[PDB]
């Protein structure tokens, strides 16, 4: 009496039971991965979980497995559940599909940032979420562990209820949500320094220089995703709004400046150049698109204040082209921009 889609997904209904344990009362979301669906708990009383039911294919469970270890290596290294990454509280083999149950949270950043119109986060959420991100990934760095899927959908808010707001310049409602709290979340892709390194990681929107041109990467890569993310969370669109690496490269150059010389003697992807420069058609669709819509970094910025100039800074730091170079997340978090956090904030008690 357990049955699958055409692809792995199991069928599933509101009310249905798993593991004698687990009622599903809500769907949450779909991925790549599989299903996510609301859960009652009945044998911690009713408490509510998320849980995440993975597709009954290879590929996927394998990804499953590997999450769960994360997870495990995680909360033996953070028992006091200090450094913001979600709560895994039960994971099991249902049928084929690896199923783990998480804390409830609310809705994820990019969701929110959906229902609000892609209307931005004010700076200060900017920052308490910038800083958040930078405290979770710092100690996944220092446990050689590299996240590598890292973007505005695998981040949470604790609780997205909200206070509407009505802006007068712009003539129109604004969420606001109330509490800026968030975990970080889905580690299917996460990656340990002694693990085999594939060449392509990320999705393309978050994904960094050093992967596209397959100079290799580890934990750099995760700071360059979080700039995007910053940039995301700050403008409400997409830094690099692309579906190919060459448009992604000119994108890149015409957002950051030029690529670096001694990346581009080093990578084997040298169709991408000739003379050392950025080869491109300018006609095409991506061309025309690129030229119409990509400008210098500094041209984004919305106001003149410190606190912008700051978050800029950090962001060109968080993107700089070569790995070796950029920010690191342990520096990151003694930048000026943190200076406005407020103490509680600072310190993680909302
Ligand atoms: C559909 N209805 C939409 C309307 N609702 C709501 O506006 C509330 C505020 C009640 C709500 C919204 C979203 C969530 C949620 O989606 N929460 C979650 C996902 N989620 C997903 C992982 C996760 C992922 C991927 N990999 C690993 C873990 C972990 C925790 C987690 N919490 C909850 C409440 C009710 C629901």
Same mark, same amino acid.
């Given at each position: 009496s357990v049955e699958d889609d055409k692809e792995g997904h199991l069928v599933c209904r509101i009310g249905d039971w798993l593991q004698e344990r687990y009622e599903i009362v809500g769907n949450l979301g779909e991925g790549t991965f599989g299903k996510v669906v609301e859960c009652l708990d009945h044998a911690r009383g009713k408490s509510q979980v998320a849980l995440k039911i993975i597709r009954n294919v290879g590929k996927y469970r394998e990804a499953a497995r590997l999450e769960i270890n994360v997870l495990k290596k995680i909360k033996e290294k953070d028992k006091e559940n200090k450094f913001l990454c979600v709560l895994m509280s039960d994971w099991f083999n249902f049928h084929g599909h690896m199923c783990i149950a998480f804390e409830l949270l609310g809705k994820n950043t990019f969701e929110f940032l959906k229902e609000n119109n892609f209307q931005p986060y004010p700076l200060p959420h900017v920052r308490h979420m910038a800083y958040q991100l930078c405290h979770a990934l710092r100690f996944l760095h220092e446990n050689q562990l590299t996240h590598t899927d890292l973007k505005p959908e695998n981040i949470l808010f604790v609780n997205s209820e909200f206070e509407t707001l009505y802006n007068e310049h712009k003539s129109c409602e604004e969420k606001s949500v109330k509490n800026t709290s968030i975990r970080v979340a889905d580690f299917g892709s996460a990656t340990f320094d002694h693990e085999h390194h594939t060449t392509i990681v990320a999705t393309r929107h978050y994904r960094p220089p050093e992967v596209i041109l397959?100079?290799?990467?580890? &934990?750099?890569?995760?700071?360059?995703?979080?700039?995007?993310? *910053?940039?995301?969370?700050?403008?409400?669109?997409? *830094?690099? &709004?692309?579906?190919?690496?060459?448009?992604?490269?000119?994108?890149?150059?015409?957002?950051?400046?030029?690529?670096?010389?001694?990346?581009?003697?080093?990578?084997?992807? &040298?169709?991408?150049?000739?003379?050392?420069? *950025?080869?491109?058609?300018?006609?095409?669709?991506?061309?025309?698109?690129?030229?119409?819509?990509?400008?210098?970094?500094?041209?984004?910025?919305? &106001?003149?204040?410190?606190?912008?100039?700051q978050l800029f800074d950090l962001m060109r730091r968080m993107l700089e082209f070569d790995p070796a170079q950029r920010i690191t997340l342990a520096e990151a978090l003694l930048h000026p921009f943190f200076a406005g956090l407020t103490p509680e904030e600072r310190s993680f008690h909302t």
């Open positions: 397959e100079l290799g990467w580890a &934990q750099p890569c995760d700071v360059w995703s979080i700039g995007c993310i *910053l940039f995301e969370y700050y403008r409400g669109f997409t *830094l690099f &709004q692309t579906h190919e690496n060459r448009e992604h490269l000119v994108m890149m150059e015409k957002i950051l400046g030029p690529i670096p010389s001694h990346m581009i003697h080093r990578t084997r992807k &040298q169709k991408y150049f000739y003379k050392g420069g *950025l080869v491109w058609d300018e006609n095409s669709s991506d061309g025309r698109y690129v030229k119409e819509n990509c400008k210098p970094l500094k041209s984004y910025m919305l &106001q003149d204040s410190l606190e912008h100039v």
